[PDB]
Design a protein around this ligand. Structure first.
Ligand SMILES: [K+]
Ligand SMILES: [K+]
Lengths: 343, 343, 343, 343
């Protein structure tokens, strides 16, 4: 459960959608006027936020903002530009820029700079290769049907379009090769689809792997640091655990694990506190662990564990947990007894 | 060989299909009445099953059912609602809900709960990014062709449809850019398909991996526990073997390994018993192993080994088997001699 | 280079294609008769081969053929059945069965039996789930547009067809949703493609991995056995090398490594012999290794190494080679001196 | 940042594009003449380059070129052939061959020779199976609709085209099965899309993995060698680091890491030198390392580090860095103090 946990992400989305509702031709005066003024108000809310950021050079503990401020700058300045420069009806186009804000929430863009950054001698090379296949296809298609269909295969651009249709396996159905050689050639084109199709995917494979891997220094190094338990484990041991550990922040008054809900892992608390729906309500603070009972005996959730407040939790798999227990029998002993304490 | 192994899975399917046959317009009086009454009978069968579950809070050994009961409840109550409230012909729609039942047999949903559960700060961000890309394309396409085709590109929704067609690589062929800039733009869209296309796939990569991984605590920890052989092996050693071990339940009188069929692995028996088609018919119970002869000597199946009854088997790869043998020479010695025993 | 190495594979192919040339309607008497008679002759050649296999239960080295014989049986009996039963022109359809021969050459079916065999409690579950989504889409699409287009959406199967078109991202262009609800629904359908799309691919990921892995017992256990060099290395060490080692057979008089071609790996000879184009032509037999010079000094191929005859070779990567050298300094010393011998 | 880093790659591309600009039918006298002459000049530039290469058999440090020269030979000779033999307007087709030049800049073709080289006994087998499935569909589709649509399903090649459309999930929309059996069959065809579609992708999975892996002998062995730091680490330790290490060449006067930009890794310098925007400008030569401060304390880039000149850099991830530090506490000590030196 994730309700009110991300206050900033939740509010922006409706504003983003309003841009589309407005952009409809032949709309009545009553709706269009209201919607148009709304963007000005949304723009103003962002404008207010900007002043706080522009004016303020303090963040508290740790933060860095050069690439990020620029995104914010473009987002607010553009709507302003359209409003002032354009007295005309079509300035709503400029309001599209809010699309950029979602870039900020995600892990991938800062990481991508780097994904793109260390593997592009090969990555660009593959895309350039792609341009080549497309061009070759345009040439091959043009030569075969130019006499029969001056209208359809009249020019290279027309043939290239057919390739666009065929190449990504979209196909329109408006243009087809009447001739035998043409269909056989298509058989080769159909096969070339194999190489092309693979391209779309190999790229994401690396970006996503690295993106998850990065959470390891913050969430699995600094975050783990909170749990004193991890101190006895070796550097080599930690990395395996580090890839394994995962993170979320559960909102207050919500339930992390329902009572009796199958429990095949345990949760560690980094920040915030949780409450255990037990004979003796137990509040767990940072560095604490729960649901270990579930692993030691194999039974579901011991108690409904509810995050009293927004709390950051780490989870350990039964496979991983066993590794912890074998490494440190004394620690395993601690979980067994602590578990008794929870129930 | 899987025949009568899953008694519940086999029966539900015909009922599921019948919902579609009924939903055909302009059907004759004779057939439609009969098929319509069938749903009431199937509904009743489920109703009977529900009473057993609702009424009974007892199971056998260990079981947990909160998320699951709700599914069953919705599946039966809805058909009821349609039958009573609606005397009208179109109540067959309500019978669709049986599609929910298949969710229950699979490993994916409870695990998915977790897959979605610990990786969605990034996952949602990706989908949100996607909504944005679709929107940008709608705007871009509309601006270029509005004057030429008021009929086709007259409005954003119309442009958005083209994007739907192009984006997933489906393409209808009823709409196409007539202008040079439009086709060039399509070239970027064609490329943007690369990122989009990857989205569909990255998500499944993690869920499926985790789903197989999960079988490890039950099938590869508790299940292995049955074989006394695994006790010597270290915690570190077990995980590699654990990922490697796989499971099924072979039904009675069926053949697990046809005699002379190639034997490149061995089978371990957790539950049930098996029979070996040899000079001395041998019945193997839980914790027992067979086919080892095949591995020690490299030979095909020693005997037709048939499951006398429904039996749960674990199998070990030749690569993995060697690891077992190297770790414990005495165990390797045992398998060689046991193997003599089987033949 | 692969030319005459696979004699059986080369010959079957032309015959396989001939089935299609014959099937074309309104062909002249002169050509059609000739092609028709050819199948009878090809059938006869296979018939001769069958008698050899049926009559003979001898192999002379080690072999197993129950599942395989059945394929051969069906392939020959069917053409026979059509020839005798049908004096009619359309018996060429029966000749299609030769397509089964290709299954025999490949690694995948015997393995697939097994891939399907230990993972289907989950794989079937996913496919059945897929049927459910398809059905749900048919229902949702039908209800929305039945009044407007009784001709297009008049029935469930008409709607189902649209689903087939949309679902695999094929899209014909003939049918589209005019209504607002329909296009928005399409947005969900567009997203549902994510799950559908990954399905096609997740399955192949497992079979192909396993298929390559399997060559390890034959090629990387028994095959390695030939090289005395591998004897010193530990069971744990061998598996890493075993995944790494790869195999082919290079035909006689051909070049394995053209002289001065880059040499970033070395080759081991299991069967057959090779010749080294050097000051002292050197013939290497089984258990021998070459191109080690290339790794020790980093230089390209030392000499043109050509297989005098059909030879089976294993190759070791530079990363892997270093591991071999670090494990056994004495062995590394041997490769350096042997290398001097080659040059 | 990559600007003037690749001088040869940058210039060739415009020439490649001009081939398409010329090939447009019904163009004016003024433009077509000029563009046509440009190819002759570009051809001449390449001709000039070839003479240097043909004439010169010496490079500098270390090089090889048999397969590569042939590519260059074909590229230059063909345009010449068209120029001399063809006085006619359509000799621009011959200019397409420049597409080959991009093959040279990439990792994949030499590696592909090898990817194709050790795994094609299986890869060809997969494709052959594919050709067969296509044929089976042609036969199946023809038989069902031949009487109803003699014009559409009149012949096998007409049916085969439908298969081309359906199989790659392109679909034109011009041809559809009217009959019930045909649509049901399509459901199986739709599902067969699972296997086919995955084909396009499994191939790239291995080539790409190997392609990145190869950079390890040059970049991660030779690159490792420049840094004296890597000498202490064990052979087993190096491979994990080797896969992890990545490379690029940042051009002169550009910024490697912007000041204050986040610093979650460090950079090692193999060739060239860098300058640190610090109190005491520091120039780092080969074997040197920077950004370690960022890792030791976790803070962003210490100083703007700019490559004074074209410089080749290696980077170490925080997870990997910790491994380095744990293996050699004294080295960790060195980085902490060196880091102080940088700031
Ligand atoms: K399509
Ligand atoms: K189409």
């Amino acid at each position: 459960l994730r309700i009110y946990a991300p206050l900033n992400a939740v509010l922006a989305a409706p504003g983003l959608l309003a841009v589309a509702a407005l952009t409809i031709p032949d709309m009545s005066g009553r709706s269009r006027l209201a919607l148009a003024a709304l963007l000005a108000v949304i723009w103003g809310a962002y404008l207010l936020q900007l002043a706080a950021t522009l004016l303020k050079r303090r963040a508290g503990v740790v933060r860095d903002r050069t690439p990020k401020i620029a995104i914010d700058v473009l987002a607010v300045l553009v709507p302003l530009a359209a409003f002032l420069l354009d007295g005309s009806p079509d300035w709503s186009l400029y309001c599209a820029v809010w699309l950029l804000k979602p870039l900020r929430d995600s892990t991938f863009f800062p990481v991508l700079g780097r994904v793109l950054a260390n593997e592009a001698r090969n990555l660009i090379g593959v895309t350039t290769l792609f341009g080549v296949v497309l061009f070759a296809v345009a040439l091959a298609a043009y030569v075969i049907e130019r006499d029969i269909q001056p209208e359809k295969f009249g020019s290279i651009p027309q043939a290239m379009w057919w390739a666009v249709v065929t190449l990504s396996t979209t196909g329109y159905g408006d243009t087809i090769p009447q001739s035998f050689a043409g269909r056989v050639l298509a058989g080769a084109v159909m096969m070339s689809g194999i190489g092309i199709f693979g391209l779309w995917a190999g790229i994401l494979a690396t970006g996503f792997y690295q993106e998850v891997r990065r959470g390891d220094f913050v969430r699995n190094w600094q975050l783990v640091a909170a749990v004193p338990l991890f101190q006895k484990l070796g550097p080599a041991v930690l990395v395996e655990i580090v890839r394994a550990l995962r993170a979320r922040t559960v909102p207050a008054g919500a339930v992390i694990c329902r009572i009796g809900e199958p429990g095949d892992r345990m949760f560690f608390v980094v920040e915030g506190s949780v409450s255990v729906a037990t004979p003796n309500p137990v509040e767990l603070g940072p560095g604490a662990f729960f649901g270990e009972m579930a692993l030691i005996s194999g039974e579901p959730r011991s108690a409904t564990v509810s995050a009293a407040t927004t709390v950051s939790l780490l989870s350990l798999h039964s496979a991983d947990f066993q590794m912890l227990c074998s490494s440190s029998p004394e620690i395993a002993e601690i979980f067994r007894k602590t578990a008794l304490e929870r129930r």
